[PDB]
Amino acid sequence: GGTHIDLLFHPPRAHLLTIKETIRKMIKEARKVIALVMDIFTDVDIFKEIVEASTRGVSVYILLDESNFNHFLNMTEKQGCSVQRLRNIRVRTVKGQDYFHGKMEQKFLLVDCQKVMYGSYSYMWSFEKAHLSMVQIITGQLVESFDEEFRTLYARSCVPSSFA
Amino acid sequence: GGTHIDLLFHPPRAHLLTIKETIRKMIKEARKVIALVMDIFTDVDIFKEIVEASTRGVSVYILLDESNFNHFLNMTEKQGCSVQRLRNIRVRTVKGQDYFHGKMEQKFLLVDCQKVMYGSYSYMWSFEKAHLSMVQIITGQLVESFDEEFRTLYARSCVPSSFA
Numbered sequence A, B: 001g002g003t004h005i006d007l008l009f010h011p012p013r014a015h016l017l018t019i020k021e022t023i024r025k026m027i028k029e030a031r032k033v034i035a036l037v038m039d040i041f042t043d044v045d046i047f048k049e050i051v052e053a054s055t056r057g058v059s060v061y062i063l064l065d066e067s068n069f070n071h072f073l074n075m076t077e078k079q080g081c082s083v084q085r086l087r088n089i090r091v092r093t094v095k096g097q098d099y100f101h102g103k104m105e106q107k108f109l110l111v112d113c114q115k116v117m118y119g120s121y122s123y124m125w126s127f128e129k130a131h132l133s134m135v136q137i138i139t140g141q142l143v144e145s146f147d148e149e150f151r152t153l154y155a156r157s158c159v160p161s162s163f164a
């Protein structure tokens, strides 16, 4: 087996779902595991879908850029929905080399070791309404390289300071 | 023919060249055309390579995020190297929908309609020294989709205001 890749764009071009609707669909259809690497995560709709998935029993692992993590924490506080009290979600932070903050500038979503969304869309209102972006939907062989990269990032991640 | 994809990382993992050395190599080996879509372009080494390519006769088309274009202009002024006086380089800007600036958040390099570098590396010192990032080197069938996306972006681009 090879690798299959479909492109999606924001705004949409020659496909039926927006990128955001495709993210929510990927998450709603997850059976086993969600592995997410994201620079900035403030989009409440996407967060809700991930929380719902975790309540069905899906194991969710989230790696967030350290410098922007406060924005995720602010969003989860506003929502009354602490990741520390959700048993099936683990969140850790990843940073680069400071000099000015070094950042984890990689974004992808990996579901059931089966499908990846890889591209320039960040989970924020601005990507739904303001920015131009594109992603690949990847299935097949190359997915295993994303699994390996998620594990690689996970190994260099830290428990966030906030958490006890 | 299908599509072939190799991953590269910053910092490097199981490959010989850094992403930046691979960018310079792609550019130095271009025979015909370079098509670049970039959010922020301040890296002087990469810029030098693109100028050299244009002086060999390579047609270079650069699409830059509008909101960050001043940073490119500042870099080319510091370098004494105006894109308006280089006959084989065209530069245009692309913007999103403002509300706060909407941005073109897509980055890729497309050389000779043959090879693409697609991923999270921006052409700035910070990506060489501080940030974690990854790209794909793509060849084969999927390259034609990047060609089509470059043309799509180009059609929605503007002459930058500075230029006369």
Ligand SMILES: COC(=O)[C@@H]1C[C@@H](O)CN1C(=O)c1ccco1
Pocket (backbone or CB within 6 Å): A010, A011, A012, A018, A128, A129, A130, A131, A132, B096, B097, B102
């Ligand atoms: C599917 O929803 C949309 O495409 C909306 C509809 C119109 O408001 C344009 N738009 C944008 O999101 C956008 C982002 C960058 C440039 O435009």
Ligand SMILES: COC(=O)[C@@H]1C[C@@H](O)CN1C(=O)c1ccco1
Pocket (backbone or CB within 6 Å): A096, A097, A102, B010, B011, B012, B018, B128, B129, B130, B131, B132
């Ligand atoms: C090939 O050059 C490098 O990898 C340098 C060497 C060491 O200084 C680490 N590094 C980084 O660029 C970096 C970016 C994010 C985290 O580390």
